[PDB]
Design a protein around this nucleic acid. Structure first.
Ligand SMILES: [Zn+2]
Ligand SMILES: [Zn+2]
Lengths: 645, 645
RNA sequence: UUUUUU
């Protein structure tokens, strides 16, 4: 749908800055106008109240452009007098997007006075005194609970003359109290306007004289991971190709031999092949296990699927960006078909068809007609292992050759020949190469998020959410490959691509400690390189916070760590560390859930309240907050934590 | 707006109990159908997924009636094939409402097998094993986070035979983990159906042979507080009339003396008069300070404005209910114009006009046309004092005779004749008597709620919310009294009447300890009598929990308590108690907000982190959780806390 | 925001 203007904040003419708001659209009008992208309302003022399906925030007009945050608006069109207006500017790096200001909209003029006395206008038309501190930061004269600032992103910071200094994007909090604000300065809007809206990164970058990082944006099947490195190799270059998937990485061996007559080296956890060829395929995980960049080994490093936001890819790419030049490379290529900000466009091979309530097989509130999947080879994406098992058991009950696939299972359970309805989670994508006659997509994803809940410390929460544009493109892309495909779906939308949660940063530190023998300080250097690099997925900068937390987690019980590592579940280090503190305190775990199985051996001996460090799931036992590590982590919580409102 | 069926949960018809969801309507259709109240979709199944504008939950058909929870549906109609269906049963006491089941709806059969193995069907078609343990309680075999049961209000609990045992209304939580569930049993549906559909409480109750608690539901202006007690008195009875407000109580006295020829006793903080007459007027607050019911003094006690959910009224009515019979009363009358479940209905003398965006005067997102208040006498309700000052300031500066009124101010500032526009908070309700040509209503108000946030204990927060039906009808009733009147409004709905927050219970214990020398045990007795009485406002039963908290708050500093009581702000006991702990620790208060003003003179001596007991506002200072009282309150948080989901 | 008891 489109972003919709549903009100405005009117600013005063002069003398003491004041504001009041007007609501011009209800809920029904917002939903309708969002669906059609056609809004015939007349626009007034320089600050608009805008809304999506589920969220409401602000947009500020400067220099004929209506500006807001990428994290709120994504890549969405704005509903306009003659239909949806396509974004004219999209700067994920700066968390900034802009549409051509509709007629009737007035702009603020960029500030030039250099005043540091600023005034933030909130979505409730409050005018809040702010003292400028940096190019992008200002302190609140009166700290306020972060909830006071909710929905105010996109709102203007004004100088005393009423000129635009920037737009609000996030609150800097101390234990949930906003003491400062982070904003996108006007200078950043200027820079965005005068960058060329069309940068072509569709051709393989040329190897430069001195080190550069370049982007390669090319459609799936265009040969980013095969044709491109083989071309480079032909020119005499040594090339390393990094990819998140073991199945994909192995697959490159055979394909390169027959397609380009190169027998590349192959590096994965499960299998290493050294031929001495000038092209090497590695997973990010194996690259990290190997210690990163070996000096002099490569001229070119291609980070394939560089849009991926799993911790391994992020930490691996950060390692490349920090180490490549010193290891002698001249070119780092960040390769993807779907860079941040990208949206899913129609595909000629793929017919897209909404599911209805007609059909014999219930599926996420809708239904799948049996004739749609009886005969042929089909893939159905579910959000969870349980739903896969269920659906597969049911389809099997109707004599449908159905198999469930997900993490844990071996790919051999999928027959590479003959009819079959595969019911899988996203684990399919990294574990199995191959396409289908149709894809049916629940359009949701299970994701992890951090909450700085202070009860006592933080919580890592798992929730089911609407899929983003990368998820949609990749699930859909399992059909229509050199064949006419069909894509069936529950919902038509897609969340904005190219952002990830702070919890993923937590995962990186965890992996560094657990698998890769990285001190938290070293993990930070790598993640800092990632964060400093334009054109990649973006995340709140909580590096100093997470580093501080892991830095305090000393003398882990090597035995428990071995067990969580082997067991293969999330946060092996944090889980092993809580188990360690428990055992040394001679106390029980937060629960006897499976997450804590490494403790069973001690079950009869462990008693009293849990010295809880943080929340990684439900806590059923009683809790004590007396442990020194709990107190240390609680102390870490007082750090500036920038969060979106 | 109506409740709208937006999907269904289809139950297995044989063998093991299973379920799946069918979604029949999107957000758009929902909003449209809610507004029109007409829904032509065929209805199928026994379990419906239902939504309003803000929330979604379940409804279950039993015995030809579609049942759900009052806390979800309020008194709302259901969208039906020929228009809105009004509720056939509205039982606020049991949190149960029912519509006559539409055509196509099947009904679950009542369970009469006594099976203790139950299955709860969730809004997501999950089937959850539950062990029955009481008439209305069941334990989860696998405790889950409360979030999991979100939106399952109204879902069925089934026995192994697929019969209906009851409907889910709330979770019983241990530190946020649902360990058991509260449900409305089918027996309550049975008793509901077997009591009359209509009842009349419009006439003053006859004095019964033996002690009875009775209800008087009669419109404002009908003489509930004057004509009624006069008539009782004329029959030879001694009457005590209790009312929340001093102004009201003094007003009735003066009136009764001239228009009903008797000089009533009067008991208020500011004015107490003993005339020896048979009728006495008192505030609930003075009645409490008097120690409650005095033996033999009254035949009849009229608890006027018994819908009121302020702590003084609730504790005062609970005291009447615990004490009256033993004190020799013959009759308690619970009198109100707006009992729980009531709604604001169209009023002949009142034309109701929605504000639009056309007007010179900005008002809560809309505007007031200057020609609607330029000549005459009008009343404007704002949610805060600030707004009242600011709107008065603007209006006067536009040539309109505008006056601001709210708590603290002299009532006389209101011209009793001649063109005026009064901008007021709800203080006008008790504080000033008299009509206006029209009322303009912001439709919101300020309320407090508790969050069991465990960070470390609980939080009381103040928020601005949409008004309820009591609020709407009361504000609207200030015009159209005998004459023609106009009611103008920002928004058209109203939240259900007759419910209050657990934070009010907290305030009752606070006032018990601060003002009335009640031990928490004694307060629990009076509150329990209130909660056990049918037909009064309802609240979650957290008496044991709150009693336990206050029981641990011993040896308060009398000086701090004297100051917080005198300053008139909420929770004087909790505030003075946190101050006591800080002062004795030489530690600062949570912040230097005015809430903590009693510590201002000690400021130079206070250092280090606040030993935080609970959160009553923003906490700016660092905190420690080591204090014994903090630890005691943290332990209180382990009690069963029943909460809606 | 209302309301009360000192
Ligand atoms: Zn300026
Ligand atoms: Zn039964």
């Amino acid at each position: 749908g489109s972003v919709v203007i549903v009100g405005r904040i009117i600013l005063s003419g002069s003398g003491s800055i004041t504001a009041y708001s007007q609501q011009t659209r209800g809920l029904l009008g917002c939903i309708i106008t969002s669906l059609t992208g056609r809004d015939k309302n007349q626009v007034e003022g320089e600050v608009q109240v805008v809304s999506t399906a589920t969220q409401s925030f602000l947009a500020t007009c400067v220099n004929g452009v209506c500006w807001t945050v990428y994290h709120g608006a994504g890549s969405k069109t704005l509903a306009g007098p003659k239909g949806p207006i396509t974004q004219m500017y999209t700067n994920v790096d700066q968390d900034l997007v802009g549409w051509q200001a509709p007629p009737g909209a007035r702009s603020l003029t960029p500030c030039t006075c250099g005043s540091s006395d600023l005034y933030l206008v909130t979505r409730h038309a409050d005018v809040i005194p702010v003292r400028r501190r940096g190019d992008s930061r200002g302190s609140l004269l009166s700290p306020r609970p972060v909830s006071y600032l909710k929905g105010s992103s996109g709102g203007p910071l004004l100088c005393p003359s009423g000129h635009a200094v920037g737009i609000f994007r996030a609150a800097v909090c101390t234990r949930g109290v906003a003491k400062a604000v982070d904003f996108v300065p006007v200078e950043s809007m200027e820079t965005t306007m005068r960058s060329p809206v069309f940068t072509d990164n569709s051709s393989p970058p040329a190897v430069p004289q001195s080190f550069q990082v370049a982007h390669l944006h090319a459609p799936t099947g265009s040969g980013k991971s095969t044709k491109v490195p083989a071309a480079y190799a032909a020119q005499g270059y040594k090339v390393l190709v990094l990819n998140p998937s073991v199945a994909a990485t192995l697959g490159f061996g055979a394909y390169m031999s027959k397609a380009h007559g190169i027998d590349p080296n192959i590096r994965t956890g499960v299998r290493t092949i050294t031929t001495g060829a000038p092209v090497t395929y590695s997973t990010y995980g194996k690259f990290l296990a190997d210690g990163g960049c070996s000096g002099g080994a490569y001229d070119i490093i291609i980070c394939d699927e560089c849009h991926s936001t799993d911790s391994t890819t992020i930490l691996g790419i950060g390692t490349v960006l920090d180490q490549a030049e010193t290891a002698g490379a001249r070119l780092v290529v960040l390769a993807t078909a779907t860079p941040p900000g990208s949206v899913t466009v129609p595909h000629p091979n793929i017919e897209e068809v909404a599911l209805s309530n007609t059909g014999e097989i219930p599926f996420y509130g809708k239904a799948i007609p049996i004739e749609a999947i009886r005969g042929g080879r089909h893939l159905i994406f579910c959000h969870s292992k349980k739903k896969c098992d269920e659906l597969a058991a049911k389809l099997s009950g109707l004599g449908i050759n159905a198999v469930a696939y997900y993490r844990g299972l071996d790919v051999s359970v999928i027959p590479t020949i003959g009819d079959v309805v595969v019911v899988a989670t996203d684990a399919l994508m990294t574990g199995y190469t191959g396409d289908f006659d149709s894809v049916i997509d629940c359009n949701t994803c299970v994701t992890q998020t951090v909450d700085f809940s202070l009860d006592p410390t933080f919580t890592i929460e798992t929730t089911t959410v609407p899929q983003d544009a990368v998820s949609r493109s990749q699930r859909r892309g399992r059909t229509g490959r050199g064949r006419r495909g069909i894509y069936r779906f529950v919902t038509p939308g897609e969340r904005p691509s190219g952002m990830f949660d702070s919890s993923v940063l937590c995962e990186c530190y965890d992996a560094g400690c657990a698998w890769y023998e990285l001190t938290p300080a070293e993990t930070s250097v790598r993640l800092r390189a990632y964060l400093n690099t334009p054109g990649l997925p973006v995340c709140q900068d909580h590096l100093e916070f997470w580093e501080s937390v892991f830095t305090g987690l000393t003398h882990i019980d090597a035995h428990f760590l071995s067990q969580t590592k082997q067991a293969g579940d999330n946060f092996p280090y944090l889980v092993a560390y809580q188990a360690t503190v428990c055992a040394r305190a001679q106390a029980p775990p937060p629960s006897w859930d499976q997450m804590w199985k490494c403790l069973i051996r001690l079950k009869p001996t462990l008693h009293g309240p849990t010295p809880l460090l943080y929340r990684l799931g439900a806590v059923q036992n009683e809790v004590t907050l007396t442990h020194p590590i709990t107190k240390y982590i609680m102390a870490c919580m007082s750090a500036d934590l920038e969060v979106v409102t």
